[PDB]
């Protein structure tokens, strides 16, 4: 017996009223598929949302441990297993996902087959194992037949575009996603829908359309119970306030930390956000990470040093940052900090160039503001704001 059902039966010996509470929580309408689930091995709810909501209702502290056991025990060819693979990916439960994947790639069901391979393509692209060109050739070679996977094959390319700083393809790619054509797996449709709101909030942030950003993240929140999406919605809300409302941006980051105390990844993400926030407002920055050699962390070290006129320390940092390799968005930021160290307009224009390449209208405000402080002509600034890169 899987740990989840040992637990809910011993919990039922001691309280009988749980049966109708669990049946409401799972939206089951009558405890009969709940009897079925507890008494017969391999019996599966119809929608994965039922046991997830029970596990979150009754056993939240233990959610990972209980569904790592439930998920790695399901029949991989079933609909629950396919749902489990989406559950795994959305929570960054890569240990449950990679095992589910390398068992669906080999299995006998051609619907779980393709879920497996598409998610494998995703996870190889994420870990820089294959190029963007490999990913799209392997997906095309797959002849995707499910509506779920034609949705997710575009979702995975959006994730890659977002993390590489290649924002200009995203608005067009996301508009082709149509989730209303998923009729089979309502767990996958509800979760994918949450991914889109989160991504759409991301796209509107990089378009400097900040109210629509906050509105999309907020719809994202009201739509989900997955902690990962809540994390990135509070992150996105707070980033949208970076230039306008220090207190409210900080409040959103702290909210994200408070719900993610367990996780070291989520902890560092909000910590890095608070670090950029305090550098932007030129405040004392307790969130610098000095024992790191990632570009994000070294740039925030330079930025703070620059803010406090420690140009030797800043130049040393920017010396290190030179012997490293930047994506476009990262180079924009690099040129911006070089412009503030050396007070050189050409670094700010170089910074504007790469911001234009990556189609980031949000952070391009940092070089634009510095150029105006240097008395740059306002018409030229207008013209910079309106011209685009190829």
CB of 327 to a second copy, least distance (A): 19
When the beta carbons of 183 and 378 are compared against a second copy, the nearer one is: 378
CA distance 95 to 279: 36
* 383 counts as binding a second copy under rule CB under 8 A: yes
3-class DSSP assignment, residue 72: coil
CB of 232 to a second copy, least distance (A): 31
* Residue of 237, 169, 153 lying closest to 197 (CA atoms): 237
* 345 counts as binding a second copy under rule CB under 8 A: yes
When the beta carbons of 154 and 356 are compared against a second copy, the nearer one is: 356
CB of 385 to a second copy, least distance (A): 11
CB of 347 to a second copy, least distance (A): 8
CA distance 163 to 161: 6
Select from 258-266, 309-317, 324-332, 380-388 the region that touches a second copy (CB under 8 A).
380-388
CB of 387 to a second copy, least distance (A): 4
From 198, 200, 366, 384, residue interacting with a second copy (rule: CB under 8 A): 384
CB 167 within 8 A of CB 202: no
What lies within 8 Å, CB to CB, of 22 at 6+ separation is 8, 28, 31, 34, 54, 57, 58
* 388 counts as binding a second copy under rule CB under 8 A: yes
When the beta carbons of 98 and 353 are compared against a second copy, the nearer one is: 353
Structure tokens at 32: 């009969």
When the beta carbons of 64 and 349 are compared against a second copy, the nearer one is: 349
When the beta carbons of 318 and 352 are compared against a second copy, the nearer one is: 352
Structure tokens at 134: 């490999």
* 389 counts as binding a second copy under rule CB under 8 A: yes
When the beta carbons of 1 and 346 are compared against a second copy, the nearer one is: 346
From 82, 113, 122, 356, residue interacting with a second copy (rule: CB under 8 A): 356
When the beta carbons of 195 and 356 are compared against a second copy, the nearer one is: 356
* 378 counts as binding a second copy under rule CB under 8 A: yes
* 366 counts as binding a second copy under rule CB under 8 A: no
Other residues' Cβ atoms within 10 Å of the Cβ of residue 343: 12
Which whole-number Å values give the CA distances from 313 to 2, 57, 286, 298, 341, in the listed order?
56, 51, 17, 11, 11
CA distance 366 to 303: 12
By CB neighbour count within 10 A (0-12 exposed, 13-18 middle, 19+ buried), where does 386 fall? exposed
CA distance 380 to 155: 38
The conformational region for residue 389 under phi > 0 = left, psi -120 to 50 = alpha, else beta, is beta
From 185, 194, 278, 350, residue interacting with a second copy (rule: CB under 8 A): 350
Count the site residues for a second copy by CB under 8 A.
19
Alpha helices in 59-108 (DSSP H): 63-71, 79-90, 94-104
Which whole-number Å values give the CA distances from 374 to 260, 348, 381, in the listed order?
42, 11, 12
Other residues' Cβ atoms within 10 Å of the Cβ of residue 131: 12
CA distance 225 to 52: 10
From 349, 361, 365, 369, residue interacting with a second copy (rule: CB under 8 A): 349
* 13 counts as binding a second copy under rule CB under 8 A: no
When the beta carbons of 75 and 382 are compared against a second copy, the nearer one is: 382
From 353, 361, 365, 369, residue interacting with a second copy (rule: CB under 8 A): 353
When the beta carbons of 129 and 380 are compared against a second copy, the nearer one is: 380
Select from 26-34, 228-236, 274-282, 343-351 the region that touches a second copy (CB under 8 A).
343-351
When the beta carbons of 70 and 355 are compared against a second copy, the nearer one is: 355
CB of 361 to a second copy, least distance (A): 13
CB 19 within 8 A of CB 31: yes
* 385 counts as binding a second copy under rule CB under 8 A: no
CB of 317 to a second copy, least distance (A): 23
166 CA to centre of own chain: 15
- Residues in contact with a second copy by CB under 8 A are 345-346, 349-350, 352-353, 356, 377-380, 382-384, 386-390
């Amino acid at each position: 017996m899987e740990l989840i059902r040992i637990a809910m039966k011993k919990d039922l010996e001691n309280d009988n009223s749980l049966m109708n509470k669990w049946a409401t929580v799972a939206g089951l309408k009558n405890p009969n598929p709940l009897y079925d689930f507890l008494n017969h091995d391999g019996k599966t709810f119809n929608e994965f949302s039922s046991i997830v909501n029970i596990v979150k209702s009754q056993y939240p502290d233990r959610e990972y441990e209980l569904m790592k056991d439930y998920c790695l025990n399901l029949d991989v060819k079933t609909k629950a297993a396919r749902s489990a693979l989406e559950y795994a990916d959305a929570n960054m439960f890569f240990e449950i996902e990679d095992v589910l994947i390398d068992s669906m790639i080999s299995c006998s069901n051609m619907k779980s087959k393709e879920y497996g391979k598409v998610y494998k393509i995703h996870r190889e692209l994420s870990n820089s194992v294959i190029t963007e060109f490999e990913a799209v050739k392997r997906l095309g070679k797959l002849n995707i037949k499910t509506p779920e996977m034609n949705s997710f094959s575009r979702l995975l390319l959006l994730y890659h575009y977002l993390s590489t700083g290649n924002f200009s393809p995203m608005a067009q790619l996301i508009k082709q996603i149509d989730l209303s054509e998923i009729s089979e797996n309502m767990y996958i449709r509800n979760t994918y829908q949450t991914r889109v709101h989160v991504l759409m909030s991301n796209i509107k942030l990089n378009e400097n359309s900040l109210e629509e950003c906050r509105e999309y993240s907020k719809k994202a929140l009201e739509s989900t119970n997955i902690l990962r999406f809540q994390v990135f919605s509070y992150l996105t809300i707070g980033n949208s306030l970076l230039f306008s409302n220090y207190e409210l941006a900080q409040e959103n980051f702290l909210k994200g930390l408070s719900i993610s105390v367990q996780n070291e990844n989520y902890n560092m993400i909000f910590q890095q956000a608070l670090c950029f926030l305090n550098n932007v407002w030129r405040k004392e920055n307790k969130w610098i990470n000095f024992e790191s050699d990632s570009i994000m962390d070294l740039q925030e070290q330079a930025h703070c040093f620059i803010n406090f006129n420690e140009n030797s320390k800043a130049k040393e940092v920017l010396d290190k940052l030179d012997l490293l390799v930047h994506n476009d968005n990262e180079l924009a930021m690099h040129y911006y900090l070089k412009g503030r160290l050396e007070q050189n307009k050409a670094c700010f224009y170089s910074s504007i160039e790469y911001f234009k390449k990556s189609n980031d209208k949000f952070l391009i405000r940092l070089p634009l503001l510095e150029l105006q402080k240097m008395g740059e002509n306002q018409k030229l600034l207008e013209l910079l704001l309106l011209l685009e890169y190829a």
